[PDB]
């Protein structure tokens, strides 16, 4: 119930829309992280692999 | 046994050495001048790229010899 | 857009929290290309001068980085003489959590602790990493000469 933004866009991540957390735990928003796994496998944040 | 080592820069370092230092020696002592690893060393001397367990001998690197060295630079 | 969502929220939180050590915004109506200044860092040989960088925001922004590109020559093995920055979160370490703020931080360090070892400019590099007393002189003359 934070405050947190979803470090892809800088919005909140607890607005309306799906978040993904990805096996690291990091949290996004799943738009905005799939746009990025699309074409990373790392992690935005710590940048471990997910795969 | 003085001898110089050209950088590719143009700066030029006086070692001293003894004719039976090894090519790894030399680098170490470069490494000691310079900071730089030796793995980042590439010496050459007289056109030959000296080797790391050979001698300033074995390669007919006498005093005032100008030894050459070239980092190795990723890109 | 995504990318503009993301370049106004990244303006925004500059403008409520400037930085010291830098600064930046869209040209004019150009949301997509910013200048911004970075300060040479104290105890570096570009400190006291100020560095101009042009920034462009591809549209697929943030997924893909920003160019980030100096104005300002500078005498750096990092960046070659078009301004271009060799510096790995603009390349393969992009990530999309980066911000236009952090990336002038990186590039500040950059800065301060070249990379001579993976440079741009080999020659600037050989003698960072061969005759630093030289390459300081030369990067203060450079910076003394275009950056102040
Ligand atoms: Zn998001
Ligand atoms: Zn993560």
């Known amino acids: 119930d934070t405050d947190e933004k979803c470090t892809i866009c800088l919005s909140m991540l607890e607005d309306g829309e799906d978040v993904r957390r990805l096996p690291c735990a990091h949290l996004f928003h799943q738009l905005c992280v799939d746009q990025w796994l699309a074409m990373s496998k790392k992690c935005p944040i710590c940048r471990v692999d997910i795969e | ?75 | 857009s995504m990318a503009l969502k993301r370049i106004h929220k990244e303006l925004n939180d500059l403008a409520r929290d400037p930085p010291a050590q830098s600064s930046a915004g869209p040209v004019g109506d150009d949301m997509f290309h910013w200048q911004a200044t970075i300060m040479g860092p104290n105890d570096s040989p570009y400190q006291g001068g100020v560095f101009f960088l042009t920034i462009h925001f591809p549209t697929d922004y943030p997924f893909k980085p920003p160019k980030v590109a100096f104005t300002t020559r500078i005498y750096h093995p990092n960046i070659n003489s078009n301004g271009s920055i060799k510096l790995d979160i603009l390349r393969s370490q992009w990530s999309p959590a980066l911000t236009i703020s952090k990336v002038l931080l990186s590039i500040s360090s950059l800065l301060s602790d070249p990379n001579p070892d993976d440079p741009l400019v080999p020659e600037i590099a050989r003698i960072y990493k061969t005759d630093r007393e030289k390459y300081n002189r030369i990067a203060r003359e450079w910076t003394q000469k275009y950056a102040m």
């Open chain 2, 1 to 75: 046994m003085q001898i110089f080592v050209k950088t590719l820069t143009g700066k030029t370092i006086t070692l001293e050495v003894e004719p039976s230092d090894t090519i790894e020696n030399v680098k170490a002592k470069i490494q000691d001048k310079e900071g730089i690893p030796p793995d980042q060393q590439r010496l050459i001397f007289a056109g030959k790229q000296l080797e790391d367990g050979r001698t300033l001998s074995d390669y007919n690197i006498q005093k005032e010899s100008t030894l050459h060295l070239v980092l190795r630079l990723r890109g």
